[PDB]
Amino acid sequence: RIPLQIVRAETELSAEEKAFLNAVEKGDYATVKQALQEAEIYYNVNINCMDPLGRSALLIAIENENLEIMELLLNHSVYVGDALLYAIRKEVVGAVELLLSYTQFSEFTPDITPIMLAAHTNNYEIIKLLVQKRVTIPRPHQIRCNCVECVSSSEVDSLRHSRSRLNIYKALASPSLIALSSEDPILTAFRLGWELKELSKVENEFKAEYEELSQQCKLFAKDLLDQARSSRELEIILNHRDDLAKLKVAIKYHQKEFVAQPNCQQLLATLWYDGFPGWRRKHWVVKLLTCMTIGFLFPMLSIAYLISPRSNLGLFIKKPFIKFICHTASYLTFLFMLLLASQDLHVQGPPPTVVEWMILPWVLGFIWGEIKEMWDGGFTEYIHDWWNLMDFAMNSLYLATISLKIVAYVKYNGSRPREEWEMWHPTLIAEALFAISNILSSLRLISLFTANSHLGPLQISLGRMLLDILKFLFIYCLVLLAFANGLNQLYFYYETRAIDEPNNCKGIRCEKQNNAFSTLFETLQSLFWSVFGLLNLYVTNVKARHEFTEFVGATMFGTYNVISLVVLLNMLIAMMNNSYQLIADHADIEWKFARTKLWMSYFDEGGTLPPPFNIISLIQNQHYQEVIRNLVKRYVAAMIRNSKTTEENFKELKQDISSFRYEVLDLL
Amino acid sequence: SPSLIALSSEDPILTAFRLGWELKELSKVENEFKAEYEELSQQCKLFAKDL
Amino acid sequence: RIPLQIVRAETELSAEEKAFLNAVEKGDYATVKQALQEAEIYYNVNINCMDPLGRSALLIAIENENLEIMELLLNHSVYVGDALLYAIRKEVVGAVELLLSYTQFSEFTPDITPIMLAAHTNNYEIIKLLVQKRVTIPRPHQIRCNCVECVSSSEVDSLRHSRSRLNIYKALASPSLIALSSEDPILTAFRLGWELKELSKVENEFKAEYEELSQQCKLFAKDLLDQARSSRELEIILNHRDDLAKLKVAIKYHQKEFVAQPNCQQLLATLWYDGFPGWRRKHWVVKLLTCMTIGFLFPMLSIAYLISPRSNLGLFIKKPFIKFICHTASYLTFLFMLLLASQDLHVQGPPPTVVEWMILPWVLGFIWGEIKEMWDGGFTEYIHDWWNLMDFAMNSLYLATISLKIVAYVKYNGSRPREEWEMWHPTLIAEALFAISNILSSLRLISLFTANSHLGPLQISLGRMLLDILKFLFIYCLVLLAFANGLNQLYFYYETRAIDEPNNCKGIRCEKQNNAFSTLFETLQSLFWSVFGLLNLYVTNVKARHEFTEFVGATMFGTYNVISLVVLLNMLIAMMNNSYQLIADHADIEWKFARTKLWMSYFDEGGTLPPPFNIISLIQNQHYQEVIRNLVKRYVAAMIRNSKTTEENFKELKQDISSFRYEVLDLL
Ligand SMILES: CC(C)CCC[C@@H](C)[C@H]1CC[C@H]2[C@@H]3CC=C4C[C@@H](OC(=O)CCC(=O)O)CC[C@]4(C)[C@H]3CC[C@]12C
Ligand SMILES: CC(C)CCC[C@@H](C)[C@H]1CC[C@H]2[C@@H]3CC=C4C[C@@H](OC(=O)CCC(=O)O)CC[C@]4(C)[C@H]3CC[C@]12C
Ligand SMILES: Cn1c(=O)n(CCCO)c(=O)c2c1nc(Oc1cccc(Cl)c1)n2Cc1ccc(Cl)cc1
Ligand SMILES: Cn1c(=O)n(CCCO)c(=O)c2c1nc(Oc1cccc(Cl)c1)n2Cc1ccc(Cl)cc1
Ligand SMILES: [Ca+2]
Ligand SMILES: [Ca+2]
Ligand SMILES: [Zn+2]
Ligand SMILES: [Zn+2]
């Protein structure tokens, strides 16, 4: 048997103290009033007594939404400490106003204040009631603040400090508290969400709560935008300056839902097709023919802009869709010339051919455009693209190609056959660099999948799965290096000279593979190519009759195969499946954000000419304020409607019925 | 509206068919509001199936 | 503009007919009574008038659970047609009893009867009330009935006949209607679920409804078993004869949930470990050592059973777990001898060796056991196993091996080297058949994964994914045959003799592959081996300088590769993923059903000795009835509790409040 008793005992209620609490719970006004009047004379009942759940009479009255009994208790001067917090959490309008007009256990932490709790509940009525007075919320310090107060509070009590900061940010991120008491709710939501995301990054713990607060602020901004009812209002909102200034601010703060708003996208599309008014309703063949015709005429449009920008053709290229088509056509012609560039080879450092002479201005235009973007946009914007890295690599490789071509031209004159050229001859290195540059240039077309409806979200999904690929890369590389070390340690004794080989060819790229694991570099390459099955098995064989050594090397190779293919590759497939399922829900919003960035990149005057042709306030604030007031009214009404459209509800219904019953019985 | 088609419509089935077809075409044409037109068309199709 | 009007018009209510209906809806008893009394004198209000929704006054009263107004309307002799059906569907006790004691539009089909609708609602109170009278439900005919009435009804109105049959089976499959008015609820549920599954198979349409009705019956049987509270009751239930007779009947009807009942499994486990009382609580090492010791002593136990079955060792093998261990050990020794059988080869038809002489009695025992199982169990039970197919194949291959060995022994005496033997020499065919038999025998161990907790559900999952594999097999084979036909048609002109080959070797199994597509059989094999990458590319090359033909053949081969690998194999992976996710929820129940079948296979006296040693009522009904009565009471109480633990509820609350309000106002 296990005896069961009360380990942590408390003070039990008296027989009367229990009858009085039961009367309060049942809502019988007459008996509660009689008990209150009798307590003043006889002092037999403690009006502040708790219950087995810790609730006093006032807390019971508040929880039952019994305003009459509550007010009766207040008129008898019962203990009221922290009752306002319970009234605010209960989200009952009557309790606050009643209570507003006037160390025990508490369900609320000491740092909770009435306005902070009201902001936590996100109840517009109670928040407005509290803001009607003079209430304040403490300002949180910097995310990486190092003042004496912050470090002192962190060292004295880290839990209390973290809880207080989280409560403050929960209060500030309240959509209702931003709807009121905020000059610019949209900008406030943007910057508050950004700061909450930064806190989520910094705070390893409480990361989920800061993430959800930031997401809540983002959704509040998106809903405020949703309340717009006319194009005039939407233009006023997006063009406000603290064109499309506020849209640019939203893009800066990574407000993807706000940018992907259907009305925002519709306005951006009307700006995107400046020239064509009816591009929305056209057939596939008509659109394709128009795109082909505009692309084939890109040199004409560029020349017209160069000569006279003010004409039917001079300013026709400044239109965003037309400019995009011209740049894409220019890049396509550049790639076509790159393909044609491989259609006498014994000359050491030959002069550039006609195709190379045509290619050169495109490379110069690419470099000039990159440096112009760096000079104009800035440094942080240039490095935030993450596509400028490939552009920088292409430009550097092209510059190295040109330098090596010049070196080979001015250092060699004779025509020696390539068979006897040096391994590190300048022409060979230049050609290798040019080939790598061609690969990168042709691969640069991936960034244009954003402009397409069918290819955009797919590109987003593949880009976000590249992160899982990168994560798997580390473990694969560790395994690869481990087995490379083992195989090299085992096999480096039997290294053979190239002369001994049947065709004077040494390594794994010969017709008969040999010396697969003789050196660490060759071992790494061999383990790489065994992933694709191009490494033959006999490479695990040695000329000496060391069958144990051969078997051990073969077993190492087989274990590497088993891991890298059976275990690691299937785990990679599983990770990709999970990540793609996770990111399939938000593909459209991310794609629309990326496409908005692409479209806005073509809104600027600078960079109008594609290569190689590039080398040749009070009233506005008042309008914004009135639009914001209308949006806030509409948002508040809509959210109240949505919330209107628990066991405590049934408890309140029972309380109302019982109070009515007791009143009727007393009257009769 | 399924109720507004149940009333004030000579042939509710044909009305639902053609209205759903037109809503699908609008969903194609209207790049934005695509989900709403898709759900309206699906609602008309379900109304025909329930009839 | 689109004019909107009422296409299908109706008869509008009068001003009074609307006020009277509104009074009925609000529950005002006094005004309804006054209107009813005034209608008898003035005949100004039609008491049977409908509303815009088609409901009459009685239907409104029933829908609001207003028994007083309902009874008032009944006392005034209002139209009552089909009101009982609405009362039953509403699941209100008062309406039925009231109505029970006493071609317009209807929400119920003409074939619906009060008892049928009550059974559809599965409401025990109303079903019991209706069964208290003399009510009947029509008997559905055979699933494949061909009588004149069935075909006449099907031809006259297929929709009506199908609807009537489905309604009847919905009525009969009611758990409450089976709890009452059924001699044996468990057997009734088993056979009714089986018949519903058969109907689901036969009825291509309405398949989902019959499937869910069958599943509902299965769950009802499982819940009835769940209500058992002691081992005596469970034994009485499982041992009832219309041992473990009812358990066998459940297994016959594929009642997987009933068999996988935790109490059923616990009883089956206590039977399974007859010898060991405390096998449940033992360490892994102890269990493994005990299993090894029992397995290594299987010949001793078999001999002891053969000599004296009545001894500490004679009857120790009749225990189910011990018998299973002995049979498994016997099969393992047989496989060990098969492995040893490959440790002078020029003799044509040699006498069997010592290992073959030891193998022979095991084969004879296998054949004798198979034919004994066929003779005892029957034919349908033998073919329902689906594992007896592999056993039959093994036995046939072994018999063919023995026949060919005898033929080669009695037809050849000389010792000729194998190099110059005939292609179809009897010894070679016998050896090939024996090797195939060895493969099948070793693969037969898959069926023992059922006995294991970790390997059982995995085997179930793999077996159920074999169905998706089989489905994909048809499309793969169609593609394979198509491309084989194309490649053979293209390449059969350049067929070359084996002499012309460098090593006199023709086909794809040579060191230098040749004639890959010369014949249809070889083309099929080549397309098979290209799936695994073992077909080299140069097989698409011909000696003649027909570069167009070579390119076309290479393109056909490449398209076959693309389909079969990129498209078909990934689609197979996707199908397997979906099927495995689908069947992962029910893996445990299916595994427990399979393991119960395996355990019960070792409960019988027959087949006790493994190879090769096999070749050397009223009171029971009363107890079952009382147990079933207790189970039905408990099940009814539990299901009512579960159901107790809609907008119509709020409508009823409003109706009650309004009726109380009107009564109080009238009284005051
Ligand atoms: C696919 C293989 C054969 C290589 C093809 C090389 C190029 C000819 C292809 C590859 C990617 C294609 C581009 C992919 C993305 C688009 C988006 C597309 O924009 C639209 O979808 C119309 C709606 C809009 O963008 O406003 C314009 C065509 C373009 C630039 C394509 C032009 C032709 C490209 C450059
Ligand atoms: C795995 C490779 C090395 C081939 C092994 C051949 C056999 C030695 C293995 C393969 C499958 C094994 C069997 C798989 C299933 C079981 C279930 C197992 O039963 C239990 O799990 C204990 C609980 C119970 O069954 O009552 C008894 C061992 C046995 C027969 C195993 C015995 C050893 C087997 C036959
Ligand atoms: C990692 N690996 C490997 O490198 N080689 C190459 C060796 C050089 O030829 C294997 O051949 C191999 C293998 N794994 C295997 O199958 C298992 C699966 C589970 C456990 C164990 Cl121990 C083995 N094999 C097959 C094999 C089974 C039994 C025997 Cl006796 C000998 C070979
Ligand atoms: C089905 N198939 C195939 O059988 N062979 C073997 C031919 C015999 O050597 C291919 O080489 C092949 C291929 N598919 C491909 O890539 C696409 C992808 C989409 C559309 C098209 Cl048209 C081609 N290639 C590569 C290739 C691309 C362009 C050119 Cl010009 C020539 C070869
Ligand atoms: Ca750039
Ligand atoms: Ca069998
Ligand atoms: Zn600070
Ligand atoms: Zn019939």
PDB file of N, CA, C and O and ligand atoms in Angstrom, chain C residues 272-273 279 291 321 324-325 328 332 445 448-449 451-453 455 599, ligand 2:
ATOM      1  N   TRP C 272       1.406 -19.892 -26.626  1.00  0.00           N
ATOM      2  CA  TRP C 272       2.600 -20.058 -27.453  1.00  0.00           C
ATOM      3  C   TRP C 272       3.795 -20.518 -26.626  1.00  0.00           C
ATOM      4  O   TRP C 272       4.541 -21.408 -27.051  1.00  0.00           O
ATOM      5  N   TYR C 273       3.995 -19.930 -25.448  1.00  0.00           N
ATOM      6  CA  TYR C 273       5.069 -20.348 -24.548  1.00  0.00           C
ATOM      7  C   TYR C 273       4.506 -21.289 -23.483  1.00  0.00           C
ATOM      8  O   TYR C 273       4.419 -20.965 -22.299  1.00  0.00           O
ATOM      9  N   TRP C 279       8.863 -16.452 -19.995  1.00  0.00           N
ATOM     10  CA  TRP C 279       9.578 -15.973 -21.172  1.00  0.00           C
ATOM     11  C   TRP C 279       9.371 -14.483 -21.405  1.00  0.00           C
ATOM     12  O   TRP C 279      10.211 -13.847 -22.053  1.00  0.00           O
ATOM     13  N   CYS C 291      17.164 -20.560 -27.067  1.00  0.00           N
ATOM     14  CA  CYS C 291      16.798 -20.915 -28.433  1.00  0.00           C
ATOM     15  C   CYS C 291      17.880 -21.760 -29.092  1.00  0.00           C
ATOM     16  O   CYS C 291      17.575 -22.754 -29.761  1.00  0.00           O
ATOM     17  N   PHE C 321       6.052 -23.223 -29.241  1.00  0.00           N
ATOM     18  CA  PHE C 321       7.330 -22.545 -29.444  1.00  0.00           C
ATOM     19  C   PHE C 321       8.458 -23.550 -29.655  1.00  0.00           C
ATOM     20  O   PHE C 321       9.326 -23.352 -30.513  1.00  0.00           O
ATOM     21  N   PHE C 324       8.150 -24.973 -33.150  1.00  0.00           N
ATOM     22  CA  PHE C 324       8.639 -24.000 -34.119  1.00  0.00           C
ATOM     23  C   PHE C 324      10.162 -23.971 -34.139  1.00  0.00           C
ATOM     24  O   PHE C 324      10.773 -23.928 -35.214  1.00  0.00           O
ATOM     25  N   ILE C 325      10.789 -24.001 -32.961  1.00  0.00           N
ATOM     26  CA  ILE C 325      12.249 -23.977 -32.895  1.00  0.00           C
ATOM     27  C   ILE C 325      12.834 -25.221 -33.550  1.00  0.00           C
ATOM     28  O   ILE C 325      13.830 -25.145 -34.277  1.00  0.00           O
ATOM     29  N   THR C 328      12.486 -24.920 -37.353  1.00  0.00           N
ATOM     30  CA  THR C 328      13.433 -23.936 -37.863  1.00  0.00           C
ATOM     31  C   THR C 328      14.856 -24.479 -37.847  1.00  0.00           C
ATOM     32  O   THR C 328      15.616 -24.271 -38.800  1.00  0.00           O
ATOM     33  N   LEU C 332      17.316 -25.080 -40.988  1.00  0.00           N
ATOM     34  CA  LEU C 332      18.650 -24.486 -41.001  1.00  0.00           C
ATOM     35  C   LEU C 332      19.726 -25.535 -41.258  1.00  0.00           C
ATOM     36  O   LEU C 332      20.688 -25.274 -41.987  1.00  0.00           O
ATOM     37  N   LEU C 445      13.157 -18.830 -46.345  1.00  0.00           N
ATOM     38  CA  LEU C 445      13.287 -18.352 -44.973  1.00  0.00           C
ATOM     39  C   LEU C 445      12.607 -17.010 -44.736  1.00  0.00           C
ATOM     40  O   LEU C 445      12.530 -16.574 -43.582  1.00  0.00           O
ATOM     41  N   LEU C 448       9.700 -16.800 -42.193  1.00  0.00           N
ATOM     42  CA  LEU C 448       9.974 -16.840 -40.763  1.00  0.00           C
ATOM     43  C   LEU C 448      10.207 -15.463 -40.157  1.00  0.00           C
ATOM     44  O   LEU C 448      10.305 -15.354 -38.931  1.00  0.00           O
ATOM     45  N   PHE C 449      10.292 -14.410 -40.976  1.00  0.00           N
ATOM     46  CA  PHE C 449      10.373 -13.059 -40.431  1.00  0.00           C
ATOM     47  C   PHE C 449       9.107 -12.672 -39.682  1.00  0.00           C
ATOM     48  O   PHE C 449       9.125 -11.701 -38.917  1.00  0.00           O
ATOM     49  N   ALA C 451       7.659 -14.326 -37.287  1.00  0.00           N
ATOM     50  CA  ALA C 451       7.790 -14.646 -35.871  1.00  0.00           C
ATOM     51  C   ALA C 451       8.511 -13.562 -35.083  1.00  0.00           C
ATOM     52  O   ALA C 451       8.426 -13.553 -33.849  1.00  0.00           O
ATOM     53  N   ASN C 452       9.207 -12.650 -35.754  1.00  0.00           N
ATOM     54  CA  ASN C 452      10.016 -11.637 -35.093  1.00  0.00           C
ATOM     55  C   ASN C 452       9.258 -10.318 -34.980  1.00  0.00           C
ATOM     56  O   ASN C 452       8.475  -9.953 -35.860  1.00  0.00           O
ATOM     57  N   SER C 453       9.501  -9.608 -33.875  1.00  0.00           N
ATOM     58  CA  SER C 453       8.849  -8.318 -33.659  1.00  0.00           C
ATOM     59  C   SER C 453       9.415  -7.244 -34.580  1.00  0.00           C
ATOM     60  O   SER C 453       8.667  -6.403 -35.095  1.00  0.00           O
ATOM     61  N   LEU C 455      11.256  -7.822 -37.480  1.00  0.00           N
ATOM     62  CA  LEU C 455      11.263  -8.207 -38.885  1.00  0.00           C
ATOM     63  C   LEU C 455       9.876  -8.461 -39.462  1.00  0.00           C
ATOM     64  O   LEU C 455       9.737  -8.521 -40.687  1.00  0.00           O
ATOM     65  N   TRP C 599       1.471 -18.810 -35.457  1.00  0.00           N
ATOM     66  CA  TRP C 599       1.408 -19.496 -34.170  1.00  0.00           C
ATOM     67  C   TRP C 599       0.366 -20.603 -34.185  1.00  0.00           C
ATOM     68  O   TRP C 599       0.604 -21.700 -33.665  1.00  0.00           O
TER      69      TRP C 599
HETATM   70  C1  LIG D   2      21.052 -13.154 -42.200  1.00  0.00           C
HETATM   71  C2  LIG D   2      22.016 -13.969 -43.050  1.00  0.00           C
HETATM   72  C3  LIG D   2      23.358 -14.140 -42.355  1.00  0.00           C
HETATM   73  C4  LIG D   2      21.409 -15.317 -43.354  1.00  0.00           C
HETATM   74  C5  LIG D   2      21.005 -15.944 -42.032  1.00  0.00           C
HETATM   75  C6  LIG D   2      20.380 -17.314 -42.239  1.00  0.00           C
HETATM   76  C7  LIG D   2      19.744 -17.768 -40.942  1.00  0.00           C
HETATM   77  C8  LIG D   2      20.813 -18.159 -39.932  1.00  0.00           C
HETATM   78  C9  LIG D   2      18.890 -16.651 -40.377  1.00  0.00           C
HETATM   79  C10 LIG D   2      18.180 -15.802 -41.427  1.00  0.00           C
HETATM   80  C11 LIG D   2      16.788 -15.512 -40.871  1.00  0.00           C
HETATM   81  C12 LIG D   2      16.863 -15.974 -39.430  1.00  0.00           C
HETATM   82  C13 LIG D   2      15.550 -16.281 -38.728  1.00  0.00           C
HETATM   83  C14 LIG D   2      14.652 -15.063 -38.747  1.00  0.00           C
HETATM   84  C15 LIG D   2      13.461 -15.255 -37.854  1.00  0.00           C
HETATM   85  C16 LIG D   2      13.543 -15.852 -36.665  1.00  0.00           C
HETATM   86  C17 LIG D   2      12.515 -15.450 -35.615  1.00  0.00           C
HETATM   87  C18 LIG D   2      12.897 -15.775 -34.174  1.00  0.00           C
HETATM   88  O1  LIG D   2      11.795 -15.822 -33.289  1.00  0.00           O
HETATM   89  C19 LIG D   2      11.900 -14.725 -32.357  1.00  0.00           C
HETATM   90  O2  LIG D   2      12.112 -13.622 -32.777  1.00  0.00           O
HETATM   91  C20 LIG D   2      11.765 -14.913 -30.880  1.00  0.00           C
HETATM   92  C21 LIG D   2      10.349 -14.575 -30.481  1.00  0.00           C
HETATM   93  C22 LIG D   2       9.492 -15.673 -31.043  1.00  0.00           C
HETATM   94  O3  LIG D   2       9.490 -15.925 -32.216  1.00  0.00           O
HETATM   95  O4  LIG D   2       8.723 -16.417 -30.298  1.00  0.00           O
HETATM   96  C23 LIG D   2      13.639 -17.098 -34.159  1.00  0.00           C
HETATM   97  C24 LIG D   2      14.906 -16.982 -34.985  1.00  0.00           C
HETATM   98  C25 LIG D   2      14.576 -16.934 -36.458  1.00  0.00           C
HETATM   99  C26 LIG D   2      13.885 -18.233 -36.809  1.00  0.00           C
HETATM  100  C27 LIG D   2      15.856 -16.695 -37.290  1.00  0.00           C
HETATM  101  C28 LIG D   2      16.918 -17.823 -37.251  1.00  0.00           C
HETATM  102  C29 LIG D   2      18.164 -17.546 -38.085  1.00  0.00           C
HETATM  103  C30 LIG D   2      17.782 -17.163 -39.494  1.00  0.00           C
HETATM  104  C31 LIG D   2      17.005 -18.294 -40.122  1.00  0.00           C
END
